[PDB]
Design a protein around this ligand. Structure first.
Ligand SMILES: [Mg+2]
Ligand SMILES: [Mg+2]
Ligand SMILES: [Mg+2]
Ligand SMILES: [Mg+2]
Ligand SMILES: [Mg+2]
Ligand SMILES: [Mg+2]
Ligand SMILES: [Mg+2]
Ligand SMILES: [Mg+2]
Ligand SMILES: [Mg+2]
Ligand SMILES: [Mg+2]
Ligand SMILES: [Mg+2]
Ligand SMILES: [Mg+2]
Ligand SMILES: [Mg+2]
Ligand SMILES: [Mg+2]
Ligand SMILES: [Mg+2]
Ligand SMILES: [Mg+2]
Ligand SMILES: [Mg+2]
Ligand SMILES: [Mg+2]
Ligand SMILES: [Mg+2]
Ligand SMILES: [Mg+2]
Ligand SMILES: [Mg+2]
Ligand SMILES: [Mg+2]
Ligand SMILES: [Mg+2]
Ligand SMILES: [Mg+2]
Ligand SMILES: [Mg+2]
Ligand SMILES: [Mg+2]
Ligand SMILES: [Mg+2]
Ligand SMILES: [Mg+2]
Ligand SMILES: [Mg+2]
Ligand SMILES: [Mg+2]
Ligand SMILES: [Mg+2]
Ligand SMILES: [Mg+2]
Ligand SMILES: [Mg+2]
Ligand SMILES: [Mg+2]
Ligand SMILES: [Mg+2]
Ligand SMILES: [Mg+2]
Ligand SMILES: [Mg+2]
Ligand SMILES: [Mg+2]
Ligand SMILES: [Mg+2]
Ligand SMILES: [Mg+2]
Ligand SMILES: [Mg+2]
Ligand SMILES: [Mg+2]
Ligand SMILES: [Mg+2]
Ligand SMILES: [Mg+2]
Ligand SMILES: [Mg+2]
Ligand SMILES: [Mg+2]
Ligand SMILES: [Mg+2]
Ligand SMILES: [Mg+2]
Ligand SMILES: [Mg+2]
Ligand SMILES: [Mg+2]
Ligand SMILES: [Mg+2]
Ligand SMILES: [Mg+2]
Ligand SMILES: [Mg+2]
Ligand SMILES: [Mg+2]
Ligand SMILES: [Mg+2]
Ligand SMILES: [Mg+2]
Ligand SMILES: [Mg+2]
Ligand SMILES: [Mg+2]
Ligand SMILES: [Mg+2]
Ligand SMILES: [Mg+2]
Ligand SMILES: [Mg+2]
Ligand SMILES: [Mg+2]
Ligand SMILES: [Mg+2]
Ligand SMILES: [Zn+2]
Lengths: 50, 86, 59, 122
RNA sequence: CGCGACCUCAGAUCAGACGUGGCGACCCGCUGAAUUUAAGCAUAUUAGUCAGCGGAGGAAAAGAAACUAACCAGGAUUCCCUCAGUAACGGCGAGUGAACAGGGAAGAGCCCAGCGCCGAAUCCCCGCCCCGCGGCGGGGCGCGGGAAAUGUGGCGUACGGA
RNA sequence: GGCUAAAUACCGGCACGAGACCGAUAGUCAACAAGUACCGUAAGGGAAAGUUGAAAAGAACUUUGAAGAGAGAGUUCAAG
RNA sequence: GAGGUCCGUAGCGGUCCUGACGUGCGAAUCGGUCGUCCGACCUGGGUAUAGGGGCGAAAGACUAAUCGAACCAUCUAGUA
RNA sequence: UGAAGCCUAGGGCGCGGGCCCGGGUGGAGCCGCCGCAGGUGCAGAUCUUGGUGGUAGUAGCAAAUAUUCAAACGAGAACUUUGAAGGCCGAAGUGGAGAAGGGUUCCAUGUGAACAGCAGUUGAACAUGGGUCAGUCGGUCCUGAGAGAUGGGCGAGCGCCGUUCCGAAGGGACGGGCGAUGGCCUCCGUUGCCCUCAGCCGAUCGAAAGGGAGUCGGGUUCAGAUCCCCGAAUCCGGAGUG
RNA sequence: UCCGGCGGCGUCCGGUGAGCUCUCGCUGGCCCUUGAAAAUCCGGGGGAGAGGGUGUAAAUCUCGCGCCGGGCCGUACCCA
RNA sequence: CGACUCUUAGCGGUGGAUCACUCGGCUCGUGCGUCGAUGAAGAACGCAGCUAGCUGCGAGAAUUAAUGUGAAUUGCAGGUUGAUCAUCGACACUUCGAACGCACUUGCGGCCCCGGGUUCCUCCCGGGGCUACGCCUGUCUGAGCGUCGCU
């Protein structure tokens, strides 16, 4: 909604920042088990709660 | 009209996020939290849900003060003094 | 500029005046969807924004 | 160069503040370089500048509160921050004197009948 | 009318303190079922148990007989073995059910009120001086202020006491 | 009317030591970014997921193809 | 120019074809045909009523696809 | 100088449960005998979990009239874009804009592994970067249906009832007096004390559709405009010396 | 080219309507239905008081200009 | 002959059983046995040169000081008088939360004091410190046709 509140806007800001993929240089560490970000979220599939 | 066409009228929400536990369980007309009972002073907690007790308890969060208390108890709560200067 | 969410327009203009010794006409602020507070600071006409930008180092 | 907290203890608060201000100015310039796109050298030095900020502020705070404790050393009523922060139960606990002082009746009993040290032949 | 005590009762962002909430394996106090068994079921059983509420500690609770006994008598509390699946309870059905004595672990006893006698002999706080200080205490000084006779302190408590 | 250690209890907590226990459909739901992803208005419900090699030495280079993808070549004891 | 008045749009509803579909577009939809359409009218938001309780122009109807007693966890690995 | 495991038209033993050799693959442990212990032998339980078939390249990809030509880019065009032609929506719209809800889907650049039930040079897909500016639009203020503290009562208890009901429920004020202060101690102000005056209907919450002063025109972006720039206004509050 | 570039010209004169939509106003009907509160602002009645002694006038002005300020949050897009 | 179908074997796929591993569980035992208005548990948001999650930390924000240790961290960069690790007693510790100025939009305040405005003349701006409920001891100011005494 265009008529947001401040708490909700901060919440959306944090998850918008979280929704980025993984940097490539981490895939090259010594003890690395991570191959892709499994906590991704698409705006149409998963509806974020709220 | 019992199902699919009545699912379309769901457009205003009955719960929001609350200030104690941050879960989306704060009923807006009751003005209480269904998970912690926010307006009440005491935490909502029951013995018929061991899982609910485990989901948020003392060992779950950050232990910001309590782990320091542990580390200080291992030495007896020293204060005032500092190790011998070099 | 971009600032933290706690700053007032008065606080922002006072800070700009102290750090960059420039007079300020007005300030417009908006909280960006990333989270910070973008502030558009319009100067007094007798200063030059391009000159001040070169002085600061952004260009 | 390498600002370290051992040659900063003997200084005076006014040049401490001036040095802090200079370090803050340098940090602001470094952040400007970061956002505009700069050298890996500056991008690395921003951490050093931040830690210099941290240790200068630490020295200031430590000296200030140390002088403040020296000031409040003798007085009976002192701020809660300067009071000892042990656990709440230990602050509620009886103090060393009154946990030791005893009644006249049973101290008289103790002095009249002290516990003896004896042994019994096999 | 006014003034002054006292008694009751208010108001303070008055000076200095204290409680709230969390965890909750163990503990203390209330509240408290129904599945189930009885080859049905209603008393009984499940069970003073689950769920619910309150309150702590490093343990808690209990504890120094208004006791057990009937002996040639034992002697605070708590725990273990036994007493004992016993005396007893029970549509005397299903089922439930202790205690004393005996042997060990541990071992520790004490204080008031009241009756009385000592010139309130008692306690708290403020200010000042010296000392100590991260458990705010020691000494001294205040024709300093209060509490207290509608009872503070010393002696003294059933083993008697003055 | 009141106080009182010891012997006693301890599936939570801070550290520890051990086992005729289990061995990734087992053992805690969770050996892994697990009370995580995810579903529900909510109270709550709740996973799947371990192994290259001694060492990345993780396949330079030529070649066909838009590329995936192949043919040679090469590393390794082994690319079976 | 009156009327819980008539025909008839939007809206509100849901007769008949017992039409379409019936591993559907769909865990109740589609077409034509229909009822009413100034009133006991239709509708958003706010607000109150909670489970042996609510609310019901009353069909045991509705109470989050669940109702002749909702849903969640527990007693519970309930009894056969 | 090759253990476990696995495969085998190889050789055998045992009535049988089973077992021993040979070959191959594999790369780090394993077995016989005497006793001991058990979460100890599967074909079934509309058994549990995981995987794979026939069905089968089958059903199906049929609601709402409709497409054709040329060119461009491109490795590649029934589906992209440009132009032309023919149609539809038909102002109770397939148009232009908001509320709830969604939360970056908005804009640009690039890609064609996966997804968009054919394909794609396209995309609400993926990867990089950008983007929301207010005294005069709304919230904030008011109270409505209602919700909710304190006094009080009840309650084993968490707490509940109750909203003017069993309260000493006001911390304000013109002025007058006293006391001090600053400013050319003028006159006022800050105050400190006293005199005098004083019903509130009950703290507080409750509407982005109710109540509620005051902003409009032109231009500007890729994506923002009663918000930015220009030009015209206007409201509220304040102001010793006015 | 990088242009709120430079220029000319023009932006005209009339009539109609039970027309449609919006709005302002008057009047009537209907009710055993009478169709919100509060913040806020204003006017009036009263006359406690104040101002100066004829001036360089005083108190006082809802008159005309002049001076300063207006913080916090929302604002992209979709709306089928 | 051939196609198609059936069986067996070799090789190749799909699939991930078995075997061997194991920084994980479960069970028993030992010692200790410590939260909070000096603001807990929990939650929210932020902090890395390149950083999503996990971990750590709090505007001094993948940490400061001090002590011990003694030459690294490392995926890529960068530049011994003490790098890095550990210990941890100094210092610091955002917003909610018993949560405390009133409400919970982050809105509206009041009081005292500083620095701008001012040149105290008030406004306006920034900063700092207070402003919750109950309850105890004492203090001050009070009330009563409550009990009295002097007038
Ligand atoms: Mg959807
Ligand atoms: Mg509702
Ligand atoms: Mg509780
Ligand atoms: Mg005595
Ligand atoms: Mg006080
Ligand atoms: Mg009972
Ligand atoms: Mg029976
Ligand atoms: Mg039976
Ligand atoms: Mg029966
Ligand atoms: Mg019965
Ligand atoms: Mg019973
Ligand atoms: Mg219980
Ligand atoms: Mg408690
Ligand atoms: Mg404790
Ligand atoms: Mg005890
Ligand atoms: Mg006791
Ligand atoms: Mg006795
Ligand atoms: Mg006994
Ligand atoms: Mg026997
Ligand atoms: Mg019984
Ligand atoms: Mg005995
Ligand atoms: Mg013994
Ligand atoms: Mg006495
Ligand atoms: Mg007695
Ligand atoms: Mg007794
Ligand atoms: Mg041993
Ligand atoms: Mg597994
Ligand atoms: Mg498992
Ligand atoms: Mg597996
Ligand atoms: Mg396996
Ligand atoms: Mg497995
Ligand atoms: Mg594997
Ligand atoms: Mg091999
Ligand atoms: Mg009609
Ligand atoms: Mg009709
Ligand atoms: Mg029908
Ligand atoms: Mg049909
Ligand atoms: Mg069919
Ligand atoms: Mg009822
Ligand atoms: Mg009805
Ligand atoms: Mg029933
Ligand atoms: Mg190996
Ligand atoms: Mg076994
Ligand atoms: Mg098997
Ligand atoms: Mg089988
Ligand atoms: Mg086909
Ligand atoms: Mg076909
Ligand atoms: Mg279709
Ligand atoms: Mg439209
Ligand atoms: Mg549009
Ligand atoms: Mg787009
Ligand atoms: Mg496709
Ligand atoms: Mg209430
Ligand atoms: Mg309000
Ligand atoms: Mg409004
Ligand atoms: Mg008059
Ligand atoms: Mg818009
Ligand atoms: Mg075979
Ligand atoms: Mg395996
Ligand atoms: Mg980061
Ligand atoms: Mg350091
Ligand atoms: Mg060091
Ligand atoms: Mg509000
Ligand atoms: Zn909550």
């Amino acid at each position: 909604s265009s008529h947001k509140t401040f708490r909700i806007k901060r919440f959306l800001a944090k998850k918008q920042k979280q929704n980025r993929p993984i940097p490539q240089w981490i895939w090259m560490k010594t003890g690395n088990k991570i191959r892709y970000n499994s906590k991704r979220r698409h705006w149409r599939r998963t509806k974020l709660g709220l | 009209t019992k199902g699919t066409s009545s699912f379309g009228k769901r457009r205003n929400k009955t719960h929001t996020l609350c200030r104690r536990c941050g879960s989306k369980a704060y009923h807006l007309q009751k003005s209480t939290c269904g998970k912690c009972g926010y307006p009440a002073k005491r935490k909502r907690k029951y013995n018929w849900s061991a899982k609910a007790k485990r989901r948020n308890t003392t060992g779950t969060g950050r232990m910001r003060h309590l782990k320091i208390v542990y580390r200080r108890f291992r030495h007896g709560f020293r204060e005032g003094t500092t190790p011998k200067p070099k | 500029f971009i600032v933290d969410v706690k700053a007032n327009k008065h606080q922002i203009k006072q800070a700009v005046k102290k750090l960059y010794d420039i007079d300020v006409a007005k300030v417009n602020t908006l909280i960006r969807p990333d989270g910070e507070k973008k502030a558009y600071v319009r100067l007094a006409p007798d200063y030059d924004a391009l000159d001040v930008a070169n002085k600061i180092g952004i260009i | 160069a390498k600002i370290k907290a051992r040659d900063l203890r003997g200084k005076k608060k006014e040049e401490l503040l001036k040095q802090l201000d200079d370090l803050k100015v340098e940090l602001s310039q470094l952040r400007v370089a970061k956002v505009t796109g700069g050298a890996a050298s500056k991008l690395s030095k921003i951490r050093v500048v931040r830690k210099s900020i941290a240790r200068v502020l630490t020295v200031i705070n430590q000296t200030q509160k140390e002088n403040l404790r020296k000031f409040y050393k003798g007085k009976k009523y002192k701020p809660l921050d300067l009071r000892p922060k042990k656990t709440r139960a230990m602050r509620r606990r009886l103090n060393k004197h009154e946990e030791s002082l005893k009644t006249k009746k049973q101290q008289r009993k103790e002095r009249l009948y002290p516990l003896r040290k004896y042994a019994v032949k096999a």
